[PDB]
Amino acid sequence: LASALMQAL
């Protein structure tokens, strides 16, 4: 999950 969001950065 964290990665799914952090892809933005």
Ligand SMILES: *C(=O)c1ccc(-c2ccc(C(=O)OCC)cn2)nc1
């Ligand atoms: C959420 O974006 C998220 C959570 C966890 C993972 C993930 C990817 C790969 C592994 C892995 O290779 O585990 C080997 C023990 C674990 N967790 N991706 C995305």
Ligand SMILES: *NNC(=O)c1ccc(-c2ccc(C(N)=O)cn2)nc1
């Ligand atoms: N928000 N994330 C990024 O902007 C981002 C772009 C690209 C990468 C990355 C990481 C690792 C590799 C590699 N070939 O091992 C390539 N590109 N990380 C973050």
Ligand SMILES: Cc1ccc(C)cc1
């Ligand atoms: C965990 C996280 C991912 C993306 C942004 C833009 C901020 C925090």
Ligand SMILES: Cc1cccc(C)c1
């Ligand atoms: C969406 C996404 C983020 C990070 C890494 C992978 C393979 C996919």
Ligand SMILES: Cc1cccc(C)c1
């Ligand atoms: C998918 C991803 C982007 C930026 C930083 C991290 C740790 C993960």
Ligand SMILES: Cc1ccccc1C
């Ligand atoms: C599985 C994974 C997730 C996020 C960043 C790098 C890697 C190897």
